[PDB]
Amino acid sequence: PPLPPLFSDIERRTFQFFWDTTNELNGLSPDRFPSRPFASIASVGFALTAYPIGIENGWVSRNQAIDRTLTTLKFFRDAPMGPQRTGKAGYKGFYYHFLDMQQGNRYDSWVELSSVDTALLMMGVLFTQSYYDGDDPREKEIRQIADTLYKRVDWRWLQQRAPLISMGWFPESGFIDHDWMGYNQAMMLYILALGSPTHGVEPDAWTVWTRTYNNDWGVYQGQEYLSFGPMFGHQYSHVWIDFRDIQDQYMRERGIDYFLNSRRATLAQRDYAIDNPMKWKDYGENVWGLTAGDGPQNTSQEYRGEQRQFRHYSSRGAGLRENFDDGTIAPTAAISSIVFAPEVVIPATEEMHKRYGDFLYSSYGFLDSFNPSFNYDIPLKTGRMVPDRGWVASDYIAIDQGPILAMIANYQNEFVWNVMKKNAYIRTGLERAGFTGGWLTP
Numbered sequence: 001p002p003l004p005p006l007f008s009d010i011e012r013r014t015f016q017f018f019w020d021t022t023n024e025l026n027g028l029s030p031d032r033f034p035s036r037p038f039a040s041i042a043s044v045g046f047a048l049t050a051y052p053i054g055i056e057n058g059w060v061s062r063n064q065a066i067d068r069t070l071t072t073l074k075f076f077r078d079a080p081m082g083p084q085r086t087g088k089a090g091y092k093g094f095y096y097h098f099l100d101m102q103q104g105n106r107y108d109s110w111v112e113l114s115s116v117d118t119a120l121l122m123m124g125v126l127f128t129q130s131y132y133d134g135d136d137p138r139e140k141e142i143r144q145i146a147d148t149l150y151k152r153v154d155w156r157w158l159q160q161r162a163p164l165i166s167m168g169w170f171p172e173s174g175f176i177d178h179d180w181m182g183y184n185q186a187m188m189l190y191i192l193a194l195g196s197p198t199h200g201v202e203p204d205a206w207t208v209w210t211r212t213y214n215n216d217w218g219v220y221q222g223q224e225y226l227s228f229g230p231m232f233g234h235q236y237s238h239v240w241i242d243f244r245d246i247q248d249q250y251m252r253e254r255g256i257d258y259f260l261n262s263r264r265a266t267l268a269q270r271d272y273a274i275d276n277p278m279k280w281k282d283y284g285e286n287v288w289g290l291t292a293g294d295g296p297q298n299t300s301q302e303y304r305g306e307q308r309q310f311r312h313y314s315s316r317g318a319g320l321r322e323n324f325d326d327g328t329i330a331p332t333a334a335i336s337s338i339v340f341a342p343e344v345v346i347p348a349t350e351e352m353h354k355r356y357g358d359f360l361y362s363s364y365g366f367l368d369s370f371n372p373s374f375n376y377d378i379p380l381k382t383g384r385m386v387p388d389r390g391w392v393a394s395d396y397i398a399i400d401q402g403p404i405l406a407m408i409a410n411y412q413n414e415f416v417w418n419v420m421k422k423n424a425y426i427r428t429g430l431e432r433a434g435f436t437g438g439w440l441t442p
């Protein structure tokens with residue numbers, strides 16, 4: 001199905017987000033903007049993937065993108081590293097999730113050294129490694145620094161419980177007691193750990209990652225799949241990795257793949273909004289999509305003569321696990337699933353843009369979220385009230401923006417996937433996890 005012109009505008013504004021809102025002195029992209037409290041290393045991951053999308057669509061010159069990319073990779077290479085409570089950006093090749101926008105160190109002491117967030121960064125880093133393949137000495141320098149940053153990550157260090165990778169680490173309390181367990185958006189964590197030639201993990205790590213899959217497998221809204229409620233779980237890893245046809249052991253046994261798993265998640269989200277058992281306002285066949293993102297406030301209000309819990313930033317979803325629902329829809333959820341179900345995502349995007357766009361579609365594309373049900377006369381943590389038209393976010397969230405841009409690019413010409421199909425570490429990672437068939441086939 002071809003894309004209407006609206007999608008080329010969405011692609012562009014969302015690229016422009018990462019180009020503009022990033023600090024150019026160090027290449028740190030904000031967690032959110034315009035609030036701009038601090039940077040996220042996961043923002044940076046999506047930024048590095050964004051810049052070459054801009055080159056190919058002519059929104060930025062190759063030379064600007066190189067200069068920006070080099071600034072970014074050199075910032076991380078040269079950042080102070082160490083176990084100390086202040087003054088460091090990272091440790092053991094990992095980095096703090098959140099760094100100060102100007103000085104680049106751990107924002108504050110509540111900030112963890114993050115495995116999944118380092119992971120997301122590294123996806124962008126390896127993207128730069130496989131994209132900037134020219135004989136420019138700058139592109140060569142990009143390849144080498146990227147290579148160095150990936151090799152320094154000590155995945156093994158974070159294996160506290162057996163082959164399973166911990167979520168992170170604090171100077172003040174030691175390892176985080178939670179582990180990355182399936183199913184969710186962390187497939188690419190274990191891929192990166194499996195593909196490492198310096199500090200790599202064993203195939204075992206994947207096996208046990210999959211042990212908890214069977215808590216999530218079942219039937220929701222007419223579909224049989226791994227039913228993690230938050231849409232993004234089905235998107236982040238799929239940004240860089242093409243999951244069509246290739247099958248690991250679990251999917252070989254189920255007889256599907258992770259691409260079909262995302263597609264099933266997306267139709268189910270849609271059918272959830274059609275049934276709309278919670279009877280949230282405007283939920284319907286072309287107004288849907290629940291995932292982690294902003295909302296109006298931590299509160300309880302009466303809605304249709306019942307008491308309903310409402311959150312600001314929170315996991316939101318539609319599925320058998322982690323399925324909180326406020327009435328707030330995040331555009332990234334439907335849009336970033338363009339590649340999985342374009343026959344429903346296209347009219348969804350058009351419908352939300354038409355109905356809501358005079359307040360929802362702003363300078364850098366879709367704002368993070370909106371809630372047509374929320375018209376209470378109360379203080380907000382963020383966003384704003386539009387009279388008799390509900391609530392809308394005031395911030396964009398980079399990790400919500402990143403997949404909007406990258407998944408539209410993958411729809412148009414499979415650009416992001418094709419670049420990563422050239423990275424030796426991603427391939428190795430997948431092969432060592434047990435993946436076979438499709439493009440992995442020799």
Ligand SMILES: OC[C@H]1O[C@@H](O[C@H]2[C@H](O[C@H]3[C@H](O[C@H]4[C@H](O[C@H]5[C@H](O[C@H]6[C@H](O[C@@H]7[C@@H](O)[C@H](O)[C@@H](CO)O[C@H]7O)O[C@H](CO)[C@@H](O)[C@@H]6O)O[C@H](CO)[C@@H](O)[C@@H]5O)O[C@H](CO)[C@@H](O)[C@@H]4O)O[C@H](CO)[C@@H](O)[C@@H]3O)O[C@H](CO)[C@@H](O)[C@@H]2O)[C@H](O)[C@@H](O)[C@@H]1O
Pocket residue numbers: 031032040042097110112114115116117167168176178184185233236313314315322397399
């Ligand atoms: O309380 C932490 C600080 O949160 C700040 O709020 C920011 C907000 O952070 C979210 C966080 O979003 C990140 C998320 O991935 C993180 C990961 O969450 C995973 C989840 O893990 C749970 C743990 O977080 C939790 O401690 C334990 C408690 O028992 O339960 C775990 O299940 O598990 C699901 C699977 O079921 C995963 O899908 C989910 O990703 O938690 C890790 C451990 O800390 C983090 O390292 C990891 O970053 O998603 C992306 C990565 O895909 C990441 O960029 C997000 O930032 O999610 C948790 C759990 O949902 C929230 O509690 C937390 O509020 O992130 C947004 C966007 O970046 C940012 O705008 C917010 O500012 C507060 O500001 C801080 O004050 C607070 O200390």
